[PDB]
Nucleic acid binder design. Sequence first.
DNA 1: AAAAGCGTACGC
DNA 2: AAAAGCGTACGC
Length: 272
Amino acid sequence: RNLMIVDGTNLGFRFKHNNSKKPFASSYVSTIQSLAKSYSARTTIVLGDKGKSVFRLEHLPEYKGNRDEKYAQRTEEEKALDEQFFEYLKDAFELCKTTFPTFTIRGVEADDMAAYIVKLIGHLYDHVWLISTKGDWDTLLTDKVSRFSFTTRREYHLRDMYEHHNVDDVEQFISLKAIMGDLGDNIRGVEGIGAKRGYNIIREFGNVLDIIDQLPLPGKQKYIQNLNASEELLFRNLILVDLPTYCVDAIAAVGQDVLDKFTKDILEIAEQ
DNA sequence: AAAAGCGTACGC
DNA sequence: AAAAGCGTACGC
Ligand SMILES: [K+]
Ligand SMILES: [Mg+2]
Ligand SMILES: [Mg+2]
């Protein structure tokens, strides 16, 4: 049987409907049960958000800094819908704690908890299934670890790394995200370098650490000039996007005792 | 011009 | 509340 790890806040938006009125807390938990059955899960762990990553904030103070601006500029109707939706999501998450191992850690993102759980107990299961729409969770794909997205309704396997993210493997995916950044997370990338130029540069010169050694790179294009002045940006971004490497550091950032407790809690779940 | 990179609206 | 989301289509 399998392990299933749910990105719970991410999953909540499956029930955001501008037209619908009623609570979804019971239907939220039933959906997780249904997913558990679809992915043959003997163990399901649900993860929630609880603040911006203290780790990522320490390396990039503007991490998700667009949030408070984006939420301030919502219309009257959007604010009213959101306040209902988020009240309902809180109740859904409460009700979920009755039934499944359900984790928040203050100042730690679900991403880091998921990455750590996979490495900690994933080998005790036949397969691990990740329930998230978030594409950078594919930094955790292996032959034994896959992802399902409710928005796209797609399954994502390691063999399909290229078809999805236009890269060969996890390391290339990490290198490309570090170069490109992520506007949604307010992580600046190298100006003028997107997916096409980024992949072309990675395939020629290698992964981000190799590219930094060779700086300045040759070429007279404006985006290469921007790349050659971006050493500090590239190192910083690598720490922000390399989920497998820094997941434990991200949990430890909020306290050694928090890491200790979470480690024990996860190992106890696997024994049940 | 063209593509690329870029910015934004919206469904679930 | 340093609360509170993703990918996608789409147009310049
Ligand atoms: K179209
Ligand atoms: Mg998240
Ligand atoms: Mg995104």
